[PDB]
Amino acid sequence: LKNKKLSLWEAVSMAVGVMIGASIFSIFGVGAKIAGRNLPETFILSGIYALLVAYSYTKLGAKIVSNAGPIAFIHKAIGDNIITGALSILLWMSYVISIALFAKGFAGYFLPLINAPINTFNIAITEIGIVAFFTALNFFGSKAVGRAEFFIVLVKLLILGLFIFAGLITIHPSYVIPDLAPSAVSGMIFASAIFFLSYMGFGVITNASEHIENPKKNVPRAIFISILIVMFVYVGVAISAIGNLPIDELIKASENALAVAAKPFLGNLGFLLISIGALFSISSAMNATIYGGANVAYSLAKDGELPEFFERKVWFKSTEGLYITSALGVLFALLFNMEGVASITSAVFMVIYLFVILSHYILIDEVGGRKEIVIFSFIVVLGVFLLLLYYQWITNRFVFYGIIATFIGVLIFEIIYRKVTKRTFSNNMYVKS
């Protein structure tokens, strides 16, 4: 008896697909708004943060194998307690808010495509509709869409290959050169904090590590390769879009930026292709996030453990979790705007990453690595976290309290859940590895 395993390239594709769905087709507009022409440099900077985090994930994942992902690293370092417990809930939440992000991104490209007006109602309906669709998919087609994921990722990479290389032919180099004004530089740095989520490949990979062939080798390789691929794609797309459309026209077309940005150099067929590619990209990212991420993370948080053998591409256990995940996802999507959801997601990922970096530090004699680099990584991510919170405090204080309420709500829930259920975590998550 054995799990259906992913090869290296399938694992790479999975992370690349999720990352592109979020960065290219969901939050790209927000980046044009905050970073403007410095957006290409924002992606690079966010990629540096991602690589610093990757240093820890790759060292830990070469030694520890578990579908519990970061929660296995954390348990191995600090044992079982309310922190470990709350982090398992937080990892689930990170998938929940990502679902809101994808739903929003889908609505943004979908409504202009069908000529529907942008309303608070039309947006709301389309988000509810797309989430409900992926919820229902559990019962009829989540595995089949799963088999289509690899081919959707290839196609959107080609489409974005076209966008990059055709776009570069006609770019104005005069709007490609980085703006070094103090306010252009500081917008670039604030955006980088929001755009940390652009490299959210860690989740789907490590939550699938036992379903990955030769995981001690291929989990670290998939994390590193996928980050490098998307770094090149993002920079190519930001330059091409920015060099072809007035920066203030990117911002008005925020919800579907790249389809409007394709028009100058690919005409109405480019608008159509980018829009259709966006819908498939986001769709495939949502399937990977729900069936592969959220299903795993919910069961681990609820049970304190996972089955040794299960189908990743369905809601394999505790079906109530599927409805809870979808309902909370729709809630976040209705309450906040794209920049809001992006900020909350990025904040949550940073807290997970900090505890992984800490775990790497505690377990350094066992897993290896340089203590200097690990401390450096921790300080960077913490700094970026606080920059994000500061930015929210001055820009949108509702988002600020939203972020704080999430962390606090998660910790309080853990204490109450642990007391009600007696649920505990053990080294049986990773002991066999």
* Main-chain phi, psi angles of 305, to 5 degrees: -165, 170
Instruction: List residues binding ligand CCCCCCCCCC (CB under 6 A).
Output: 7, 9-10, 82, 89, 126, 129-130, 133, 147, 150, 279-280, 283, 298, 301-302, 319-320, 323-324, 327, 415-421
Q: C-beta of 283: minimal distance to ligand CCCCCCCCCC in Å? A: 5
Strand partners, 6: 212
User: 114 vs 394, which CB is nearer to ligand CCCCCCCCCC?
Assistant: 114
User: 77 vs 278, which CB is nearer to ligand CCCCCCCCCC?
Assistant: 278
Tell me how far apart the alpha carbons of residues 77 and 74 are, in angstroms, rounded to a whole number: 5
Q: Contact 282/105 with Cβ under 8 angstroms?
A: yes
Strand partners, 212: 6
Q: C-beta of 9: minimal distance to ligand CCCCCCCCCC in Å? A: 4
User: 59 vs 312, which CB is nearer to ligand CCCCCCCCCC?
Assistant: 312
Q: C-beta of 412: minimal distance to ligand CCCCCCCCCC in Å? A: 10
In sequence order, what are the residues at sequence separation of 6 or more whose Cβ sits closer than 8 angstroms to the Cβ of residue 138? 291, 314, 315, 319, 322
User: 127 vs 210, which CB is nearer to ligand CCCCCCCCCC?
Assistant: 127
Q: C-beta of 298: minimal distance to ligand CCCCCCCCCC in Å? A: 6
Q: Contact 253/278 with Cβ under 8 angstroms?
A: no
User: 81 vs 170, which CB is nearer to ligand CCCCCCCCCC?
Assistant: 81
Instruction: Please name which of 154, 98, 95 lies closest in space to residue 280, comparing C-alpha atoms.
Output: 154
User: 116 vs 362, which CB is nearer to ligand CCCCCCCCCC?
Assistant: 116
Q: C-beta of 318: minimal distance to ligand CCCCCCCCCC in Å? A: 7
Maximal CA-CA distance, the chain? 63
CB burial of residue 5 (10 Å; 0-12, 13-18, 19+): middle
Tell me how far apart the alpha carbons of residues 279 and 112 are, in angstroms, rounded to a whole number: 12
Crossing angle, helix 338-362 and helix 28-35, to 10 degrees?
A: 90
Q: Which residue number places its CB atom closest to ligand CCCCCCCCCC?
A: 129
Left, alpha or beta for 318 (phi > 0: left; psi -120 to 50: alpha)? left
Q: C-beta of 427: minimal distance to ligand CCCCCCCCCC in Å? A: 19
User: 95 vs 280, which CB is nearer to ligand CCCCCCCCCC?
Assistant: 280
User: 129 vs 264, which CB is nearer to ligand CCCCCCCCCC?
Assistant: 129
* Main-chain phi, psi angles of 206, to 5 degrees: -75, -30
Q: C-beta of 44: minimal distance to ligand CCCCCCCCCC in Å? A: 29
Q: C-beta of 282: minimal distance to ligand CCCCCCCCCC in Å? A: 8
Instruction: Please name which of 49, 63, 51 lies closest in space to residue 359, comparing C-alpha atoms.
Output: 63
User: 152 vs 245, which CB is nearer to ligand CCCCCCCCCC?
Assistant: 152
CB burial of residue 432 (10 Å; 0-12, 13-18, 19+): exposed
Q: C-beta of 346: minimal distance to ligand CCCCCCCCCC in Å? A: 22
User: 269 vs 415, which CB is nearer to ligand CCCCCCCCCC?
Assistant: 415
In sequence order, what are the residues at sequence separation of 6 or more whose Cβ sits closer than 8 angstroms to the Cβ of residue 339? 27, 30, 33, 34, 194, 396, 399
Q: C-beta of 24: minimal distance to ligand CCCCCCCCCC in Å? A: 16
Tell me how far apart the alpha carbons of residues 204 and 21 are, in angstroms, rounded to a whole number: 13
Q: Contact 72/305 with Cβ under 8 angstroms?
A: no
- DSSP structural state of residue 178: P
